[PDB]
Amino acid sequence: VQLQQSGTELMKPGRSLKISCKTTGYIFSNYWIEWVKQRPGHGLEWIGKILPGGGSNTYNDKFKGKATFTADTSSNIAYMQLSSLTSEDSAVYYCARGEDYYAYWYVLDYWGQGTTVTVSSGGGGSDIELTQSPLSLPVSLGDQASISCRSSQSLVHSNGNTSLHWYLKKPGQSPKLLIYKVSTRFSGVPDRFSGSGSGTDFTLKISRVEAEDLGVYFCSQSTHVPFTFGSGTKLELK
Amino acid sequence: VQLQQSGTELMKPGRSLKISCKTTGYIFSNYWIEWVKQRPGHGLEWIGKILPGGGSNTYNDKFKGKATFTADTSSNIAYMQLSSLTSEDSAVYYCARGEDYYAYWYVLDYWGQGTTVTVSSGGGGSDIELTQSPLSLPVSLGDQASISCRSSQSLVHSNGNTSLHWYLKKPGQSPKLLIYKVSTRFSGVPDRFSGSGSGTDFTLKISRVEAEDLGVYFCSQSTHVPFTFGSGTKLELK
Q: Which amino acid is at A107?
A: V
Residue A64's nearest CA partner among B18, B90, B67, B231 is B90
Asked whether the beta carbons of A230 and A132 are under 8 A apart, the reply is yes
Residue A230: how many CA atoms within 13 Å on its side-chain side? 32
Distance CA B107, CA A221 (A): 9
Q: B18 and B11 in contact (C-beta within 8 Å)? A: no
C-alpha atoms less than 13 angstroms from C-alpha of A97 in its C-beta half-sphere: 21
Collapsed DSSP state (helix, strand, coil) of residue A9: strand
Angle A82-A87-A90 from CA coordinates, rounded to 5°: 60
- CB pairs < 8 Å spanning A and B: 188
Q: Are B233 and B136 in contact (CB under 8 A)?
A: yes
CA gap A141, A18 in Å, rounded:
57
Which amino acid makes up residue A19?
A: I
* Whole-Å CA distances, A78 to A103, B19, B61, B178: 20, 36, 31, 25
Domains in chain B: boundaries: 1-122, 123-238
Of the candidates A87, A159, A232, the beta carbon closest to that of B62 is on: A87
Strands across the sheet with B67-72, in order?
A: B2-5, B17-24, B77-82, B67-72
CB contact under 8 A, A66 and B43: no
Looking at beta carbons, which pairs linking A184-193 to residues 24 or more positions away fall under 8 Å?
A186/B109, A193/A166
Of B111, B119, B115, nearest in space to B6 by CA: B115
Look at residues A134, A122, A119, A111 and name the one whose alpha carbon lies nearest to residue A236. Answer: A134
Residues B178, A69, B123, A173, CA torsion sign = positive
**Which residues from chain A sit within 8 angstroms of residue B112, using beta carbons?**
174
A227–B96 CB contact, under 8 Å: no
CA–CA dist A228, B84 (Å, integer): 25
* Alpha carbon distance B220, B31 (integer Å): 52
Cβ neighbours of residue B202 closer than 8 Å, sequence gap 6 or more: B148, B149, B150, B151, B155, B164, B182, B195, B196, B219
| d(C-alpha B20, C-alpha B81), whole Å | 9
- Residues pairing with B97 in the sheet: B33, B110
Distance CA B89, CA A18 (A): 22
| Alpha-carbon gap, residue B118 to A37, rounded angstroms | 24
Q: Running DSSP on this structure, what letter comes out for residue A24?
A: -
Which residue(s) pair with B235 in the sheet?
B137, B215
Q: Which residues of A touch B12 (CB under 8 A)?
A: 65
CA pair distance B4, B78, nearest whole angstrom = 10
Contact B36, B44 (CB under 8 A): yes
**What's the gap in Å between the CA of A33 and the closest CA on chain B?**
13
Q: Which residues fall within 8 angstroms of residue B145, CB to CB, at 6 or more apart?
A: B137, B139, B205, B206, B209, B235
Distance from CA of A140 to the nearest CA of B (A): 24
In whole angstroms, what is the distance from residue A78 CA to residue A6 CA?
11
Considering only CB atoms, B65 lies closest to which of A112, A113, A121, namely A121
Contact A61 B109 (CB under 8 A): no
Residue B61: which region, alpha, beta or left (left: phi > 0; alpha: psi -120 to 50)?
Answer: alpha
- CA-nearest of A100, A96, A118 to A109 is A96
CB atoms under 10 Å from CB of A152, counted, come to: 15
CATH of A123-238, one of 1.10.3720.10, 2.60.40.10, 2.40.110.10, 3.40.50.620: 2.60.40.10
Distance in angstroms (rounded) separating the CA atoms of residues B143 and B205? 11
Q: Is residue A23 within 8 Å of residue A76, measured between CB atoms?
A: yes
What is the rounded distance in angstroms from the CA atom of residue B106 to the CA atom of residue A224? 11
Alpha-carbon distance values, A169 to A216, B36, B116, B166 (Å): 5, 12, 15, 43
Q: In what order do the strands lie in the sheet with B176-180?
A: B136-139, B233-237, B215-221, B164-169, B176-180, B184-185
Residue B40: partners with Cβ closer than 8 Å, 6 or more residues away: B90, B91
In the chain, the amino acid numbered A110 is Y
Q: How far apart are CA A88 and CA B60, in angstroms?
A: 13
**B62: Cα within 13 Å, side-chain hemisphere:** 14
Look at residues B74, B53, B70 and name the one whose alpha carbon lies nearest to residue B18: B70
Contact A109 B177 (CB under 8 A): yes
Q: Read out DSSP for A97-151?
A: EEEETTSS-----EE---EEEEE-S-TTTTPPPEEEE-SEEEE-BTB-EEEEEEE
The one-letter code for the residue type at A201 is D
Write out chain B in H/E/C secondary structure: CEEEECCCEEECCCCCEEEEEEEECCCCCCEEEEEEEECCCCCEEEEEEEECCCCEEEECHHHCCCEEEEEECCCCEEEEEECCCCHHHCEEEEEEEEEECCCCCCCCCEECCCEEEEECCCCCCCCCCEEEECCEEEECCCCCEEEEEEECCCCECCCCCECEEEEEECCCCCCEEEEECCCEECCCCCCCEEEEEECCEEEEEECCCCHHHCEEEEEEECCCCCCCECCCEEEEEC
Residue among A167, A174, A171 nearest A189 (CA): A167
Report the C-alpha gap between A163 and A180 in whole angstroms. 7
* A-chain residue closest to B228, CA distance: A46
Cis peptide before A52 (omega within 30 of 0): no
Rounded to 5 degrees, φ, ψ at B89 are -85, -15
Q: How far apart are CA B85 and CA B119, in angstroms?
A: 7
Tell me yes or no: is domain A1-122 CATH 2.60.40.10: yes
The dihedral formed by the CA atoms of B5, B6, B8 and B11, expressed in degrees to the nearest 10:
-120
Interface contact A60-B175, CB threshold 8 A = no
User: Are both A1-122 and A123-238 of the same fold?
Assistant: yes
Structure-solving method: X-ray
User: Least CB-CB distance to A119: which of B60, B65, B177?
Assistant: B65
Q: Are B92 and B38 in contact (CB under 8 A)?
A: yes
Query: How many C-beta atoms lie closer than 10 Å to residue B74's C-beta?
Result: 7
Nearest-CB residue to A46 (from B12, B62, B229): B229
Among residues A90, A108, A100, A116, which one has the least CA distance to residue A34? A108
- What distances in angstroms separate CA A73 from CA A1, A78, A224, one per listed residue? 16, 8, 52
**How long, in residues, is chain B?**
238
Contact B175, A34 (CB under 8 A): no
To one decimal place, what's the resolution in Å?
2.6
Report which of B3, B4, B22, B7 is spatially closest to residue B71, judged by C-alpha positions.
B22
Residue among A213, A140, A222 nearest A178 (CA): A213
d(CA A226, CA A126): 9
